Amino acid sequence: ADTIVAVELDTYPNTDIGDPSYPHIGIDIKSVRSKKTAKWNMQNGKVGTAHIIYNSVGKRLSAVVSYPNGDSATVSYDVDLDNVLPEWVRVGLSASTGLYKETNTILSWSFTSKLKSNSTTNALHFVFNQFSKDQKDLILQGDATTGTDGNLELTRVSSNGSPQGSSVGRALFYAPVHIWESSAVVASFDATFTFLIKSSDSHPADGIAFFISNIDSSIPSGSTGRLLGLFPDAN
Amino acid sequence: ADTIVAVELDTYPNTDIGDPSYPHIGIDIKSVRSKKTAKWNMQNGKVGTAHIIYNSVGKRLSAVVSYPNGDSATVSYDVDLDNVLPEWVRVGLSASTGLYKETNTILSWSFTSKLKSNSTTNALHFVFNQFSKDQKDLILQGDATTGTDGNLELTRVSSNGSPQGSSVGRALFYAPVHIWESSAVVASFDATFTFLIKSSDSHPADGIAFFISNIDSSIPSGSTGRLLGLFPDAN
Amino acid sequence: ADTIVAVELDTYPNTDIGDPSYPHIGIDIKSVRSKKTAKWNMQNGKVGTAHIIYNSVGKRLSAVVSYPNGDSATVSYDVDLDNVLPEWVRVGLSASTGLYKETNTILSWSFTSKLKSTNALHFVFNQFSKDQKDLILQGDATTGTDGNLELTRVSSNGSPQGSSVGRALFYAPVHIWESSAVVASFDATFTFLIKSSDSHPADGIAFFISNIDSSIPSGSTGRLLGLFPDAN
Amino acid sequence: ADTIVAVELDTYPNTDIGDPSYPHIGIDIKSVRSKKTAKWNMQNGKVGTAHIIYNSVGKRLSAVVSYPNGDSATVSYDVDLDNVLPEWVRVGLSASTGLYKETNTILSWSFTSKLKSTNALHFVFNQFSKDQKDLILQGDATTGTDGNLELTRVSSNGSPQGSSVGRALFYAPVHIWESSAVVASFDATFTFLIKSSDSHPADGIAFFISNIDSSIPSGSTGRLLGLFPDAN
Numbered sequence: 001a002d003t004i005v006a007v008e009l010d011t012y013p014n015t016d017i018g019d020p021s022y023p024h025i026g027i028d029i030k031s032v033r034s035k036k037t038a039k040w041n042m043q044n045g046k047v048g049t050a051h052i053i054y055n056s057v058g059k060r061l062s063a064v065v066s067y068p069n070g071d072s073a074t075v076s077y078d079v080d081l082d083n084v085l086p087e088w089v090r091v092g093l094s095a096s097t098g099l100y101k102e103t104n105t106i107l108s109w110s111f112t113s114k115l116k117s118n119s120t121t122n123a124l125h126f127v128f129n130q131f132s133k134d135q136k137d138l139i140l141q142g143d144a145t146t147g148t149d150g151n152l153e154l155t156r157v158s159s160n161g162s163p164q165g166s167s168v169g170r171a172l173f174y175a176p177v178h179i180w181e182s183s184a185v186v187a188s189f190d191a192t193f194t195f196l197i198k199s200s201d202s203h204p205a206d207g208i209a210f211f212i213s214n215i216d217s218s219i220p221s222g223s224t225g226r227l228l229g230l231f232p233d234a235n
Numbered sequence: 236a237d238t239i240v241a242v243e244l245d246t247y248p249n250t251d252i253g254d255p256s257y258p259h260i261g262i263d264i265k266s267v268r269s270k271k272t273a274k275w276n277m278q279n280g281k282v283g284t285a286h287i288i289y290n291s292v293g294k295r296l297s298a299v300v301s302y303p304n305g306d307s308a309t310v311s312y313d314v315d316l317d318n319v320l321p322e323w324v325r326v327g328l329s330a331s332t333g334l335y336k337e338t339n340t341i342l343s344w345s346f347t348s349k350l351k352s353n354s355t356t357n358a359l360h361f362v363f364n365q366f367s368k369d370q371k372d373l374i375l376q377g378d379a380t381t382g383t384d385g386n387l388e389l390t391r392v393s394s395n396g397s398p399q400g401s402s403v404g405r406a407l408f409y410a411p412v413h414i415w416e417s418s419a420v421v422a423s424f425d426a427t428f429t430f431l432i433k434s435s436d437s438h439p440a441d442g443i444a445f446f447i448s449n450i451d452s453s454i455p456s457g458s459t460g461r462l463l464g465l466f467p468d469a470n
Numbered sequence: 471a472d473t474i475v476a477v478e479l480d481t482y483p484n485t486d487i488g489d490p491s492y493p494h495i496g497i498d499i500k501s502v503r504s505k506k507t508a509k510w511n512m513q514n515g516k517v518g519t520a521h522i523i524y525n526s527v528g529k530r531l532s533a534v535v536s537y538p539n540g541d542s543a544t545v546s547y548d549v550d551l552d553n554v555l556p557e558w559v560r561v562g563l564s565a566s567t568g569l570y571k572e573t574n575t576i577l578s579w580s581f582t583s584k585l586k587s588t589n590a591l592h593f594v595f596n597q598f599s600k601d602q603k604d605l606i607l608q609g610d611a612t613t614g615t616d617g618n619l620e621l622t623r624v625s626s627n628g629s630p631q632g633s634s635v636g637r638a639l640f641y642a643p644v645h646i647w648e649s650s651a652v653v654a655s656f657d658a659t660f661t662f663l664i665k666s667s668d669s670h671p672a673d674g675i676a677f678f679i680s681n682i683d684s685s686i687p688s689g690s691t692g693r694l695l696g697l698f699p700d701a702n
Numbered sequence: 703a704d705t706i707v708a709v710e711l712d713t714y715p716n717t718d719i720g721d722p723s724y725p726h727i728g729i730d731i732k733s734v735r736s737k738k739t740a741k742w743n744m745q746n747g748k749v750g751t752a753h754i755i756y757n758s759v760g761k762r763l764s765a766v767v768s769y770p771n772g773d774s775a776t777v778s779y780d781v782d783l784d785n786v787l788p789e790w791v792r793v794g795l796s797a798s799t800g801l802y803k804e805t806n807t808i809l810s811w812s813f814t815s816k817l818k819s820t821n822a823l824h825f826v827f828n829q830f831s832k833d834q835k836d837l838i839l840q841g842d843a844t845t846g847t848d849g850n851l852e853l854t855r856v857s858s859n860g861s862p863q864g865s866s867v868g869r870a871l872f873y874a875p876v877h878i879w880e881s882s883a884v885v886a887s888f889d890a891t892f893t894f895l896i897k898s899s900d901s902h903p904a905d906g907i908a909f910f911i912s913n914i915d916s917s918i919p920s921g922s923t924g925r926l927l928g929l930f931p932d933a934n
């Protein structure tokens with residue numbers, strides 16, 4: 001199976017598999033059953049921003065999701081990712097729908113990774129504030145598409161604009177990322193994305209995640225719905 | 236009194252005032268008596284590197300000090316600096332000597348502060364990899380000088396190069412820094428400096444600190460030696 | 471007198487002192503009579519963006535001003551700024567009104583200077599604060615609670631006032647060149663909103679680089695854009 | 703054929719194909735016969751640094767190569783690279799030897815591309831890894847355990863070999879221009895160590911920008927620097 005570290009924006013409470021009974025942000029270490037969650041008020045049709053932060057000194061993976069009116073949710077988890085991730089990874093965004101559905105629109109995405117030693121460094125930084133129709137530095141998987149409106153649609157949307165159910169899609173940056181290296185004194189990464197989740201359903205579902213995977217990661221078969229395109233099962 | 240948050244590279248164990256019985260790196264929140272320390276092997280005459288990291292999501296102030304042979308010490312402390320620091324600060328480097336002495340030479344210093352909200356930001360970044368004789372964007376205090384060798388000598392050195400006792404000096408960046416702001420979702424800062432501590436004494440003393448202070452901070456009277464130019468007393 | 475290098479966004483043609491007969495962007499080296507200009511269609515009430523670029527290798531000072539519909543004006547001038555500026559400088563934004571007027575609202579400003587062989591300064595304001603401790607405000611310039619920097623005076627009911635001048639300078643001096651550096655470069659970007667109900671908007675906005683102790687020259691409202699004591 | 707824009711650090715004068723009669727730095731636009739050159743004193747066994755700078759406003763491609771004693775050579779060429787390069791590219795380093803030889807050791811490489819109206823790519827290698835998954839190595843190029851990138855072949859006892867050619871390309875394609883961008887800029891820096899015990903060092907190192915599927919052209923050792931199929 002793939003190795004997955006992720007931050008989930010989980011719009012649907014699947015209490016059968018350990019979700020809390022409300023929409024939530026979560027930290028996922030090799031399981032869709034978050035090691036840590038926090039209550040999250042997803043604002044239907046509003047543009048939200050997620051920030052994800054980690055470094056090898058503090059060994060704490062932190063995330064905050066916020067909307068323009070000021071409401072925010074935060075979750076942190078203490079973990080040494082050196083003991084979890086392979087040395088080389090790809091980084092990506094994933095989203096899904098199931099019996100319920102929502103747009104999983106990404107308006108922007110930035111990422112920075114640094115390996116530091118004895119000086120004021122190896123580094124990778126990319127930022128997309130507009131996506132292109134043929135975005136050659138992104139690997140799209142599943143239902144994910146980039147449009148001429150400058151956005152990344154992780155899950156399927158109809159020609160009339162409406163989201164579709166039982167959809168799953170992901171976008172990974174093209175280059176592998178050197179996420180740790182034994183001679184480095186500091187390894188850090190940061191990610192930010194902005195998103196627009198909109199639904200006319202009885203309940204929106206399923207959510208968006210930022211994830212870090214093995215370089216050859218692919219969408220697990222059957223990972224629509226509650227598995228967020230990240231995991232083959234709810235274990 | 237000034238308000239001080241600092242990371243100390245403490246070369247002399249002052250066990251009377253709560254130092255551990257070995258050289259150490261420490262996190263100082265409004266007291267020279269560190270809230271958290273870790274054992275540190277200072278390598279006499281070698282160039283070391285210190286990295287300091289904080290963000291308002293994880294609320295953990297982390298530091299690591301390392302030398303070219305690979306040895307490193309790390310300390311982290313959980314603290315919400317919003318409840319400690321004023322909104323506007325200056326950032327700086329400080330060092331002292333006492334009855335024992337050492338060179339407190341800074342070879343480079345970088346700093347980044349960011350205030351983020353709902354997007355992929357206000358920011359300040361500076362880096363000095365060489366200091367100038369007349370370094371107009373630095374406020375020097377006490378015995379601190381910049382040379383034509385490209386370094387910052389925080390404490391006094393004789394014409395023959397040898398360090399002097401009972402010395403104290405500091406360098407602050409000229410512009411005030413907006414270290415937190417209530418509408419920001421993320422406030423983060425990072426600092427890195429490289430240093431060369433060298434001594435022929437029976438024991439080196441006293442150490443170097445990176446600090447964040449009120450904008451009008453000055454060297455407390457009598458803060459040579461164990462007080463590291465940061466504090467008026469050992470309380 | 472001060473030493474001034476500036477990029478001007480000149481909304482009012484003063485053909486009396488060398489302006490072309492249209493609004494224009496210009497490169498100003500120690501005089502308000504631009505060394506190089508390009509025609510500029512200022513879009514009243516729209517948010518524009520100015521990008522300014524220089525490096526000591528190419529020794530070209532370049533600027534472009536653009537609006538969201540894509541219309542843009544560009545101007546470039548070959549100059550070795552080592553021969554013009556003091557080693558240490560301050561960097562700033564300036565604007566003026568005169569007999570005609572406009573808002574000179576800055577929504578964001580960023581700046582980067584590097585000396586490589588690296589020393590570097592970078593700041594970004596995407597929202598300004600009411601009491602902006604790392605800005606030196608001169609003349610009529612204020613920062614509000616709307617996150618913007620108003621370079622010239624605006625009345626309580628929101629409207630711009632005439633014969634106004636104001637500037638904002640970054641607090642720290644900047645080391646703009648150093649003889650041992652292989653590359654000295656700088657870049658600046660700002661976004662602005664110029665709005666006018668006048669018969670003609672005037673006078674404009676500039677990004678400028680000055681001696682560290684620069685102050686608004688006496689009488690520099692109107693066509694002198696808060697930068698120069700005279701039209702020489 | 704490939705489409706190539708390059709900055710060459712040319713250690714061997716091939717006056718037969720248009721080189722000046724001295725080692726030189728040159729700007730190459732779709733041909734090995736540089737559009738612009740400048741005399742260059744390569745310092746055998748010393749670590750040098752190359753800085754390359756371009757932006758779509760000034761439309762000047764500039765480069766400087768320098769050593770720690772301060773000696774430097776600079777070359778600039780006015781060109782609109784929108785008219786030359788494909789929208790998407792890969793960026794890389796290339797080097798060759800021929801009948802004379804040298805080490806073509808890269809100690810560090812950084813690159814930044816930005817499209818503003820911002821999209822951006824930045825990478826920095828200050829130490830290379832043995833299995834460098836974000837580099838595409840072509841020809842004789844290898845990465846070691848000493849943290850360096852060896853573009854041409856070196857023998858087990860450390861010495862450079864003749865008629866060798868190798869390149870390293872960053873794994874991700876780069877969006878080097880986009881029609882809606884107001885500013886498209888890129889910058890690259892690399893540090894290198896060219897060492898030779900030969901009667902003359904040869905042939906040199908280049909930073910280059912190519913079509914995304916670029917490969918070493920057949921026969922491009924020696925004076926063609928791994929970039930071009932011929933001297934046209």
Ligand SMILES: O=C(O)COc1ccc(Cl)cc1Cl
Nearest residue numbers: 519578579580596659660819
């Ligand atoms: O922050 C800055 O000053 C530079 O970023 C920008 C520049 C131009 C435009 Cl249109 C939008 C942005 Cl965010």
Ligand SMILES: O=C(O)COc1ccc(Cl)cc1Cl
Nearest residue numbers: 587751810811812828891892
């Ligand atoms: O990392 C890079 O590629 C750029 O940084 C440098 C550039 C030139 C020199 Cl001499 C030294 C350094 Cl650290």
Ligand SMILES: [Ca+2]
Nearest residue numbers: 010012013014
């Ligand atoms: Ca769920």
Ligand SMILES: [Ca+2]
Nearest residue numbers: 245247248249
């Ligand atoms: Ca002590």
Ligand SMILES: [Ca+2]
Nearest residue numbers: 480482483484
């Ligand atoms: Ca005018």
Ligand SMILES: [Ca+2]
Nearest residue numbers: 712714715716
């Ligand atoms: Ca040649």
Ligand SMILES: [Cl-]
Nearest residue numbers: 014015016017
């Ligand atoms: Cl369920």
Ligand SMILES: [Cl-]
Nearest residue numbers: 232233234235
């Ligand atoms: Cl299952």
Ligand SMILES: [Cl-]
Nearest residue numbers: 249250251252
């Ligand atoms: Cl004691």
Ligand SMILES: [Cl-]
Nearest residue numbers: 467468469470
């Ligand atoms: Cl005391």
Ligand SMILES: [Cl-]
Nearest residue numbers: 483484485486
């Ligand atoms: Cl006139």
Ligand SMILES: [Cl-]
Nearest residue numbers: 699700701702
């Ligand atoms: Cl006059």
Ligand SMILES: [Cl-]
Nearest residue numbers: 715716717718
């Ligand atoms: Cl020849």
Ligand SMILES: [Cl-]
Nearest residue numbers: 931932933934
């Ligand atoms: Cl040929």
Ligand SMILES: [Mn+2]
Nearest residue numbers: 010019026034
């Ligand atoms: Mn969940």
Ligand SMILES: [Mn+2]
Nearest residue numbers: 245254261269
């Ligand atoms: Mn101590």
